[PDB]
């Protein structure tokens, strides 16, 4: 079902970091634009 | 100097995801507490 003996390679770091940094940036962009469109008064 | 033949294992995904999700959560906590402590009026 879940054949895996765990890992510990260096390449895993670079890849793991890229993913995290990618999700972060994408979040900031969305949030910014979101708050921009919604403008002031966010509760109606 | 940089001995690496690239990777492509599954374990890399689970690890990469955890890192990204970990950085995100940590960010939210900091931001929330930050804005909370700073309270209204953030420019003095």
UniProtKB/Swiss-Prot annotation, chains A, B:
Effect listed in the UniProt record for changing residue 15 to V: In allele B2 and allele B3
Tissue specificity as recorded in UniProt: Expressed in a variety of tumor tissues including primary breast tumors and tumors from small bowel, esophagus, kidney and mouth.
Record note on modification: Autophosphorylated. Autophosphorylation occurs in trans, i.e. one subunit of the dimeric receptor phosphorylates tyrosine residues on the other subunit. Ligand-binding increases phosphorylation on tyrosine residues. Dephosphorylated by PTPN12.
Motif Nuclear localization signal: chain residues: 36-44
Coiled-coil annotated spans: none
Transmembrane segments: 13-35
Disease named in the record: Glioma: Gliomas are benign or malignant central nervous system neoplasms derived from glial cells. They comprise astrocytomas and glioblastoma multiforme that are derived from astrocytes, oligodendrogliomas derived from oligodendrocytes and ependymomas derived from ependymocytes.
Quaternary structure and interacting proteins, as annotated: Homodimer. Heterodimer with EGFR, ERBB3 and ERBB4. Part of a complex with EGFR and either PIK3C2A or PIK3C2B. Interacts with PLXNB1. Interacts with MUC1; the interaction is enhanced by heregulin (HRG). Interacts with KPNB1, RANBP2, EEA1, CRM1 and CLTC. Interacts with PTK6. Interacts with RPA194 and ACTB. Interacts with PRKCABP, SRC and MYOC.
Function: Protein tyrosine kinase that is part of several cell surface receptor complexes, but that apparently needs a coreceptor for ligand binding. Essential component of a neuregulin-receptor complex, although neuregulins do not interact with it alone. GP30 is a potential ligand for this receptor. Regulates outgrowth and stabilization of peripheral microtubules (MTs). Upon ERBB2 activation, the MEMO1-RHOA-DIAPH1 signaling pathway elicits the phosphorylation and thus the inhibition of GSK3B at cell membrane. In the nucleus is involved in transcriptional regulation. Associates with the 5'-TCAAATTC-3' sequence in the PTGS2/COX-2 promoter and activates its transcription. Implicated in transcriptional activation of CDKN1A; the function involves STAT3 and SRC. Involved in the transcription of rRNA genes by RNA Pol I and enhances protein synthesis and cell growth.
Assigned protein family: Belongs to the protein kinase superfamily. Tyr protein kinase family. EGF receptor subfamily.
Protein name: Receptor tyrosine-protein kinase erbB-2
Source organism per UniProt: Homo sapiens
Gene that encodes it: ERBB2
Range within the parent protein: 641 to 684 of 1255
